[PDB]
Design a protein around this ligand. Structure first.
Ligand SMILES: Nc1ncnc2c1ncn2[C@@H]1O[C@H](COP(=O)(O)OP(=O)(O)O)[C@@H](O)[C@H]1O
Ligand SMILES: Nc1ncnc2c1ncn2[C@@H]1O[C@H](COP(=O)(O)OP(=O)(O)O)[C@@H](O)[C@H]1O
Ligand SMILES: [Mg+2]
Ligand SMILES: [Mg+2]
Lengths: 414, 7, 188, 173, 385, 134, 7
């Protein structure tokens, strides 16, 4: 009757929560955290210093949105965190109220973006070992968890370790290949554009292309993206002229409800049905620094690894992540990759003649469930493995060596 | 290069 | 040497995986040349000798003179920079160092084995070279069984099956009492 | 950038740096008449709905300069036409905007003046003047026929929403 | 002929030109090419510009240009780009030379495909119609600037590294090896790391931006363990540089590990063995009478070897190899072993010196070059070697 | 398994580079002439001697002599000395200063204060830059 | 080998 460990997938967006050895993440709540801050002016020599017990006088989760007298302040920003005191407060609140798990008799696994600096991991591990006194800890990249969860798509019994994952995120979407359990360290790239700035662009365009909404209830209006309201588009200008020609049937309407005066307000739906999701393959719209597509990045990263691994990698691309829920995404990526790889093969064959014909490279995109969350099941299987109880860093290791035990990274080595 | 490496 | 020349052609291979790839390529698309200069001249007219190989990634590599260049290193060690002689010269020297009478028998019987002697035409080239070096008054014969790869294993199995060899083995008792030096005196 | 110019044969002439690509117009200028409806202005209007979003533009051919200039002028045309009331009023505004004195390339007041050339001889100066005036008039005549709609006789919000999305972050003004 | 000869090294990163019998190069310009581009982010046209521009002007006006590199690792990618660069350097404002009555010296990298040499010589003979040309190996162009008839070259630069040991003058082709490491790669890596720090960078012009930062701040270490402990125990090694736009960035730890890829190619996905280990293996694989002479005389050629501290790391590594793989830790016999790395002050440009000195004495006699006449015949090329 | 070993076994010289008594000090102590006791303690320093015995003997004797003093004549004791004597003194106090326990702090602090008042920062400089194991 | 050649 051994107690199960605890599985947590922290991040910038909706933080997944639940226990190991289970088939559904029970709690999925935002990162919004309340605080009894107000208007002091001395805010850089006493940030808060709440007198008495007012320090803990703050809510958390979905209940924290509807508190109109505090401040909703997200602690995370695309992985990197400025102030981690809010993170500690959120962690204690969750573990006690929601999870109800005693740290001294439980094992915690945490997930961080691959670009997280060593200092943040070291100091969060130190904080955990000092305050929570967790017997064991383990941090790993989320790509492998997604790969493990991808087995459920079809033929679980057929072991398939090779592949590559392009995961989404509220502020980051990364690319990580797997070569029979061992990933490549140098063949990893970080994409800054993600599923948040897209909504920023949507609302920015909407605030001028339409009127009839209140400033407060903007994001709820901007969340038409999460609805059926965005389809990807093999061509841009074609659909532009399609809308500018008819502009009658392709236009949709919004019927949101105000959260203050309970007065209905409506606005039409325009070019944003596709432009947002199209920004992924044209990031230049939002971020001027990163004028680089995604599919070509995928082929480049897959072309910077040994020959024997290039072939199977193209065959296994996993559709996991919230921002990847957009329809026809896989078709576009598959078609683009096939076109570029076929062109490269033809160029290679042109220089050296021959009547032969190489077997065409096969690129296939797999669509399945688990797309919204592919890290939780990986953590559950992580906990269920007995070897996890042995690999996890121990207390005595942190006792005198320090929190450096958690500094191991997949893209470092001397 | 033509085969192996880019150049 | 094959990797080095493949570099001169335009194809680069450094790590061990490409070492295995080049090993397979040599195993599949290499042969010896009866005449080096004539083969080079025919390569100057490169329209019937080039061959193509399919890499795992799908890239196609065209190999020309390299097919008959690397094997020639056996007969011309100077290519790698080794100050030695070829297999033909070494065999001639070894046979000459033997007694005169047994030279005839040694010439009449020349067994070859190993995985490096499967290149087609190697036997003919060796025969031609030996006859050119040796006096042109007797007959030199080359025997090239088609199963020379596992000849050593077959010989070991046959030797083990021999009844007389059942007593020549080295057991734990005698080894422990005598010591590791026993094997040195066991048939040299 | 990705959606650069098209329809530029090598036989096309030039004026210093720009490509004197024919434009079909009932007005008068130093340009010929092309029977096909396709021309520089049609492509510019077709691609303006997307060129603004991008933040770069490589001038693969000389027609890229013409596309840049036409889109830049269209930005100002849309900005000035947002306050329109009647189709006749919009046409009047576009006409009085076409017959103006805007910064000619090679002179101050012109953005990205480095890319464009500086005319030297006298005749090319008025040649370019007339060519640009004809282009402006044709653009004005082309916008008025699609910007307005048979109903509500007002500038469609869809076509004036890009007023603040100045090309290359800046306009002629 | 005109008794006029110009020596050039059309390498990968930088291109140097100059006349024979010259102590230092007259003109030094890099290999930068880029079509005009307008960035909607910031900045607009200020001064004149042309459709195709290269040379030093790019180093100053890359802000509004799509800078691209034509050559890397000494191999041909874009024939037209190299043709344009050659036209520019041969124009009346860079060299101003008469093609029909001039001779040139070329220094192609060792161990490269013959197609590049054939293409370049054919281009020079046809497009520009030079009377005669030559191709030389870096070994002579280096050892000939100080009077050395024996040594091992560790020439490193943009592209790939190379080695060409020579004993008593006669060449030793069977003891040369190539590795996929160079300055460009050290750059890609300063980049993955400052990205971690949290800065977003492109691959168009900032690649040239990081060049100065690597030149000033980047340095190599003596012992990895001590330097790493110092970095993690102290923050004095932190330093910055003023960007052209006025932005300020902090780099204290990434400036040290980037050169370590030279001795640890594992960091950049290469199954290398290390420059020092490779040198030791190459020396050992040779004969015996030459090992001591090779060790005694050794040169550190190339601009990518100007990193501060490389000689110390190399000599220490070589001594460690000698101790562990030969003496099995017997330090007492190790004392007498001696090494003297040859590091001339003019390590930024030595090939040009060798070419100038060669042309000084190899100009009067016409039986050295590939004269224009031989080109018109078939069954040609490989004239000398 | 290479650089692991040090290669620092060089040859360049890494700068390869008369004790006190007890009976006289005891006689001075019992006689009460504390100044003579201190003078004898500072006499015959171990300037040239490689042995922990004499070092610890000198440290213990100087510590014991200093401890017995009162905070009225310390200025007189310091004054009746030469500058080199003051430097040697301060060196002895620093040497015995590491000795913990037995409340050997306050008197040493007062002695250091008086030495600073008289010897000055030059004494600190001399004690800090004296490879001479004293 | 130990002396001469590698092995
Ligand atoms: N069905 C959906 N359609 C469009 N966007 C979605 C959808 N589901 C999630 N998203 C977007 O993906 C983001 C969440 O992805 P997620 O990776 O779970 O955040 P995190 O990085 O903290 O794990 C949300 O910001 C949301 O906008
Ligand atoms: N001071 C330096 N620090 C680091 N790298 C340098 C330095 N100087 C040059 N380099 C690198 O060496 C490369 C070229 O060196 P160089 O040998 O002069 O090219 P080439 O072989 O054509 O003469 C450059 O790309 C640059 O990255
Ligand atoms: Mg995420
Ligand atoms: Mg050079």
């Amino acid at each position: 009757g051994r107690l199960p460990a605890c599985v947590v997938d922290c991040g910038t967006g909706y933080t997944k929560l639940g226990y190991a050895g289970n088939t559904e993440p029970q709690f999925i709540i935002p990162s919004c955290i309340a605080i009894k801050e107000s208007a002091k002016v001395g805010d850089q020599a006493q940030r808060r210093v709440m007198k008495g017990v007012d320090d803990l006088d703050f809510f958390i989760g979905d209940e924290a949105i509807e508190k109109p007298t505090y401040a909703t302040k997200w602690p995370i920003r695309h992985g990197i965190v400025e102030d981690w005191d809010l993170m500690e407060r959120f962690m204690e609140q969750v573990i006690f109220k929601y999870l109800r798990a005693e740290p001294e008799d439980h094992y915690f696994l945490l997930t961080e973006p691959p670009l997280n600096t060593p200092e943040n991991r070291e100091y969060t591990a130190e904080i955990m070992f000092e305050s929570f006194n967790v017997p064991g800890l383990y941090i790993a990249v989320q790509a492998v968890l997604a790969l493990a969860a991808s087995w459920t798509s079809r033929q679980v019994g057929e072991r398939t370790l090779t592949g590559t994952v392009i995961d989404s995120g509220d502020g980051v979407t990364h690319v990580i290949p797997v070569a029979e359990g061992y990933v490549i360290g140098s063949c990893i790239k970080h994409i800054p554009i993600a599923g948040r700035d897209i909504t920023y662009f949507i609302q920015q365009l909407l605030r001028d292309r339409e009127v009839g909404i209140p400033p407060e209830q903007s994001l709820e209006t901007a969340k038409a993206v999460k609805e059926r309201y965005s389809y990807v588009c093999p061509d841009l200008v074609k659909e532009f002229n399609k809308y500018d020609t008819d502009g009658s049937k392709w236009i949709k309407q919004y019927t949101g409800i105000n959260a203050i005066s309970k007065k209905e307000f409506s606005i039409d739906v325009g070019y944003e049905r596709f432009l947002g999701p199209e920004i992924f393959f044209h990031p230049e719209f939002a971020n001027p620094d990163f004028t680089q597509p995604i599919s070509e990045v995928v082929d480049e990263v897959i072309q910077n690894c040994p020959i024997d691994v290039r072939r199977p990698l193209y065959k296994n691309i996993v559709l996991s992540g919230g921002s990847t829920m957009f329809r026809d995404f896989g078709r576009r990526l598959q078609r683009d990759l096939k076109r570029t790889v076929d062109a490269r093969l033809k160029l290679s064959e042109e220089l050296s003649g021959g009547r032969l014909k190489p077997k065409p490279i096969d690129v296939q995109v797999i669509t399945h469930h688990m797309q919204r969350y592919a890290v939780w099941f990986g953590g559950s299987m992580l906990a269920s493995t007995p070897e996890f109880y042995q690999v996890c860093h121990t207390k005595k290791d942190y006792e005198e060596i320090g929190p450096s035990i958690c500094r191991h990274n997949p893209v470092f080595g001397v | 290069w033509x085969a192996x490496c880019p150049a | 040497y094959l990797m080095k020349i493949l570099t001169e052609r335009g194809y680069s291979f450094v790590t061990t995986a490409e070492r295995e790839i080049v090993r397979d390529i040599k195993e599949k698309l290499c042969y010896v040349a009866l005449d080096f200069e004539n083969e080079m001249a025919t390569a100057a007219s490169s329209s019937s000798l080039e061959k193509s190989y399919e890499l795992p990634d799908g890239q196609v590599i065209t190999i020309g003179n390299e097919r008959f260049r690397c094997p020639e290193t056996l007969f011309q060690p100077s290519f790698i920079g080794m100050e030695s002689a070829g297999i033909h010269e070494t065999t001639y020297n070894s046979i000459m160092k033997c007694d005169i009478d047994i030279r005839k028998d040694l010439y009449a019987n020349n067994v070859m084995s190993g995985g490096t002697t499967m290149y087609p035409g190697i036997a003919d080239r060796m025969q031609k070279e030996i006859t050119a070096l040796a006096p042109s008054t007797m007959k030199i014969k080359i025997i090239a069984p088609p199963e020379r790869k596992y000849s050593v294993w077959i010989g070991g199995s046959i030797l083990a099956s021999l009844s007389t060899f059942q007593q020549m083995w080295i057991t734990k008792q005698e080894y422990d009492e005598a010591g590791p030096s026993i094997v040195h005196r066991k048939c040299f | 950038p990705a959606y650069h110019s098209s329809l530029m044969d090598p036989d096309t002439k030039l004026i210093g740096n720009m490509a004197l690509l024919p434009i079909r117009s009932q007005f008068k200028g130093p340009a010929p008449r092309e029977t096909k409806d396709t021309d520089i202005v049609d492509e510019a209007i077709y691609y303006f709905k997307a060129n603004v979003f991008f933040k770069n533009y490589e001038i693969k051919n000389e027609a890229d300069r013409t596309l840049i200039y036409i889109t830049l002028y269209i930005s100002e045309c849309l900005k000035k036409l947002q306050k329109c009331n009647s189709k006749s009023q919009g046409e009047k505004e576009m006409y009085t905007l076409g017959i103006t004195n805007f910064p000619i390339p090679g002179e101050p007041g012109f953005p990205l003046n480095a890319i464009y050339a500086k005319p030297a001889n006298k005749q090319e100066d008025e040649v370019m003047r007339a060519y640009l005036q004809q282009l402006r008039q044709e653009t004005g005549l082309r916008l008025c026929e699609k910007v307005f709609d048979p109903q509500n006789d007002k500038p469609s919000k869809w076509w004036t929403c890009f007023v603040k999305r100045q090309f290359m972050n800046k306009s002629l003004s | 002929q005109g008794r006029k000869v110009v020596v050039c090294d059309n390498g990968t990163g930088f291109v140097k030109c100059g006349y024979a019998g010259s102590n230092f190069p007259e003109h030094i310009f890099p290999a930068l090419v880029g079509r005009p581009i307008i960035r909607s982010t910031t900045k607009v046209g200020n001064i004149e510009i042309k459709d195709l521009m290269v040379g030093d002007e790019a180093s100053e006006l890359r802000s509004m240009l799509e800078v691209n590199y034509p050559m890397e690792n000494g191999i041909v990618r874009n024939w037209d780009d190299m043709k344009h660069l050659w036209d520019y350097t041969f124009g009346p404002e860079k060299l101003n030379i008469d093609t029909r009555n001039c001779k040139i010296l070329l220094t192609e990298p060792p161990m490269n495909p013959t197609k590049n040499r054939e293409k370049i010589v054919e281009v020079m003979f046809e497009t520009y119609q030079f009377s005669g040309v030559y191709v030389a190996i870096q070994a002579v162009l280096t050892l000939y600037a100080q009077g050395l008839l024996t040594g091992v070259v560790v020439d490193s630069g943009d592209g790939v590294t190379h080695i060409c040991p020579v004993y008593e003058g006669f060449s030793l082709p069977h003891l040369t090896r190539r590795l996929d490491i160079a300055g460009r790669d050290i750059t890609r890596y300063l980049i993955k790391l400052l990205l971690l720090r949290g800065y977003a960078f492109n691959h168009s012009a900032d690649f040239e931006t990081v060049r100065m930062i690597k030149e000033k701040l980047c340095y190599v270490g003596y012992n990895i363990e001590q330097e790493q402990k110092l970095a993690l125990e102290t923050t004095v090694l932190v330093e910055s540089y003023t960007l052209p736009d006025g932005r300020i960035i902090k780099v204290g730890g990434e400036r040290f590990e980037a050169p370590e890829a030279l001795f640890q190619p594992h960091l950049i996905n290469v199954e290398g063995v290390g420059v020092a280990e490779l040198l030791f293996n190459t020396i050992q694989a040779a004969d015996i009478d030459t090992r001591s002479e090779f060790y005694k005389h050794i040169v550190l050629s190339g601009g990518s070897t100007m990193y501060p501290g490389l000689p110390s790391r190399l000599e220490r590594e070589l001594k460690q190899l000698y101790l562990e793989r030969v003496l099995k830790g017997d330090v007492e016999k190790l004392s007498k072993f001696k090494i003297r790395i040859e590091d001339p002050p003019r390590r930024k440009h030595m090939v040009f010196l060798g070419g100038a000195v060669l042309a000084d004495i190899m100009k009067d006699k016409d039986n050295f070059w590939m004269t224009r006449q031989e080109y018109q015949e078939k069954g040609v090329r490989v004239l000398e070697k | 398994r290479f650089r692991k070993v040090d290669v620092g076994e060089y040859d360049e010289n890494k700068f390869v580079d008369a004790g006190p008594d007890e009976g006289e000090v005891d006689s001075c102590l019992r006689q009460g002439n504390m100044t003579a006791a201190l003078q004898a303690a500072l006499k015959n320093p171990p300037i040239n001697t490689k042995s922990q015995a004499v070092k610890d003997r000198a440290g213990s004797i100087v510590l014991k002599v200093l401890i017995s003093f009162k905070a009225n004549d310390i200025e007189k004791a310091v004054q009746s000395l030469d500058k080199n004597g003051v430097d040697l003194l301060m060196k002895y106090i620093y040497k015995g200063f590491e000795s913990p326990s037995d409340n050997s702090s306050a008197v040493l602090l007062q002695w250091h204060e008086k030495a600073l008042a008289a010897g000055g920062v030059g004494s600190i400089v001399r004690v800090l830059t004296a490879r001479k194991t004293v």
